[PDB]
Structure formats: C-alpha cells, structure tokens
Structure 1
Amino acid sequence: KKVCACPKILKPVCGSDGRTYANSCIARCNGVSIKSEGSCPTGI
C-alpha cells in the first residue's frame, strides 16, 4: 500500500554485496547500490 511502484522491466543488476536482483529498484530497496548493470559472473 504505497503511491510509488518499482518497474517490471527485465533489467537486472549486480549489487555491491555481489548478489543479483531483478532491477535497480529492488536492489536499492535492500539498502544497497548497484555495482554494475546486468547479472554478474558467479565465477569471480
């Protein structure tokens, strides 16, 4: 129940914790910034 709503577009990001979230809005809602655009490589 809010006037704001996050986007539903398929544009995921790697957060500075090294997790991937579905978009920039959901990433910021955890209290953390985006390290880069796109999903990140699990091999590093």
Structure 2
Amino acid sequence: KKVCACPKILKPVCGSDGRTYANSCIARCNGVSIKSEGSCPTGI
C-alpha cells in the first residue's frame, strides 16, 4: 500500500470531510476536497 508524505509547510486548512490538513494536497490524497481555511476544530 502507498501513502502521501505530508510536507513541512505551515498555515493548515479544513477539508470537506471536516478535518484539518497541512495543505490541499493531503485532503486530495484522502479523497476529500478543500472547503475552508485554518486548522479545523473538533466540532465544539
């Protein structure tokens, strides 16, 4: 099984699954799309 290696960049974003990613590249490798900006909350 292959997997993407997350880069060393900062200012993460929120995918359309409702989870945090270091960039759009990572959400895409999980089958998610970018939705909003910043680190996403746990749901609180």
TM-score using structure 2 length: 0.61
CA RMSD of aligned residues (A): 3.5
Q: Sequence identity of aligned pairs in percent?
A: 100
TM-score using structure 1 length: 0.61
Segments of 4+ moved more than 6 angstroms = 1-6
Q: Where does the alignment leave 5 or more consecutive residues of structure 1 unmatched?
A: none
Q: Where does the alignment leave 5 or more consecutive residues of structure 2 unmatched?
A: none
